[PDB]
Amino acid sequence: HWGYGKHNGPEHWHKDFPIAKGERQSPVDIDTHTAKYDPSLKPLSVSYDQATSLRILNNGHSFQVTFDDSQDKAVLKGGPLDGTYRLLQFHFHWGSLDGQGSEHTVDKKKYAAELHLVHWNTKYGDVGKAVQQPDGLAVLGIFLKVGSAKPGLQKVVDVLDSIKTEGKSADFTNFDPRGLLPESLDYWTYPGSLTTPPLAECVTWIVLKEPISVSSEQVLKFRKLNFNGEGEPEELMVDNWRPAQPLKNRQIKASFK
Numbered sequence: 413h414w415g416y417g418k419h420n421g422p423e424h425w426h427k428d429f430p431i432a433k434g435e436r437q438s439p440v441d442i443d444t445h446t447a448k449y450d451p452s453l454k455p456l457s458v459s460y461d462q463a464t465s466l467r468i469l470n471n472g473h474s475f476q477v478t479f480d481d482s483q484d485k486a487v488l489k490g491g492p493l494d495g496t497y498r499l500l501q502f503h504f505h506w507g508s509l510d511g512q513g514s515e516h517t518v519d520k521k522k523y524a525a526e527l528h529l530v531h532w533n534t535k536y537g538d539v540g541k542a543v544q545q546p547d548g549l550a551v552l553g554i555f556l557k558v559g560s561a562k563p564g565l566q567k568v569v570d571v572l573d574s575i576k577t578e579g580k581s582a583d584f585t586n587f588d589p590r591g592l593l594p595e596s597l598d599y600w601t602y603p604g605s606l607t608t609p610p611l612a613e614c615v616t617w618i619v620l621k622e623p624i625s626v627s628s629e630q631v632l633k634f635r636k637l638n639f640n641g642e643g644e645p646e647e648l649m650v651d652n653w654r655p656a657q658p659l660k661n662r663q664i665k666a667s668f669k
């Protein structure tokens with residue numbers, strides 16, 4: 413099955429998922445000088461005060477924190493979106509070294525990691541129906557650079573030792589995703605895809621201009637996780653990012669001058 417190694421990595425995915433070579437694939441390079449400022453874009457509305465985190469899980473390609481999406485508790489609206497999108501989960505993509513790990517790039521610059529907050533359009537009732545729609549999902553992407561620690565991330569990194577290998581999970585309640593957001597909600601947006609199989613072309617991407625800073629000790633804890641299950645040869649969970657895909661007939665818009 414698919415992964416991030418030499419023999420099953422991103423250059424192989426198109427064999428099982430031919431949409432990998434489609435017209436609106438993600439991630440992409442964000443050319444900041446070619447993005448078009450669109451003063452008709454609204455501010456993003458991030459309403460996370462009633463978020464209910466449930467569990468944290470090593471799924472073999474990342475780790476994810478999952479939320480109760482049975483009600484409008486933590487929702488994204490506005491920006492380029494029509495309607496209301498419910499937070500399902502967040503996860504990260506990261507590198508073996510600090511100069512790579514993000515999926516999106518900015519003027520070809522790679523960041524150490526990229527946070528994805530995954531939301532689905534309540535129009536479609538469940539995330540399985542939403543992935544089959546061109547406007548089914550909205551993913552909020554946030555870049556991580558290495559420097560000062562992000563205090564709001566520490567509760568996450570401290571439990572990773574308990575989900576080291578594929579398939580492990582743990583309860584993970586009362587985690588507040590607002591402690592992962594940067595000051596500014598200035599963003600770029602473009603139509604795209606999931607960055608892991610099935611690579612469905614169902615995502616409105618909203619990528620924040622301002623990265624968050626995390627400490628070296630925080631990102632090193634990411635790099636101790638395992639792709640493998642317990643009892644298999646240890647393969648560190650690093651470089652779990654898809655590289656930039658061709659922009660083709662798309663324009664990236666900016667909410668900011």
Ligand SMILES: Nc1ncnc2c1ncn2CC(=O)NCCc1ccc(S(N)(=O)=O)cc1
Pocket residue numbers: 478500501528530539540543551605606607608609610
């Ligand atoms: N816990 C849950 N409850 C209900 N349904 C759930 C679920 N977990 C998974 N499903 C199905 C699902 O979500 N498929 C989409 C997977 C996805 C891929 C890549 C990106 S990415 N890298 O583009 O952001 C983001 C999301």
Ligand SMILES: [Zn+2]
Pocket residue numbers: 503504505528607
């Ligand atoms: Zn992702």
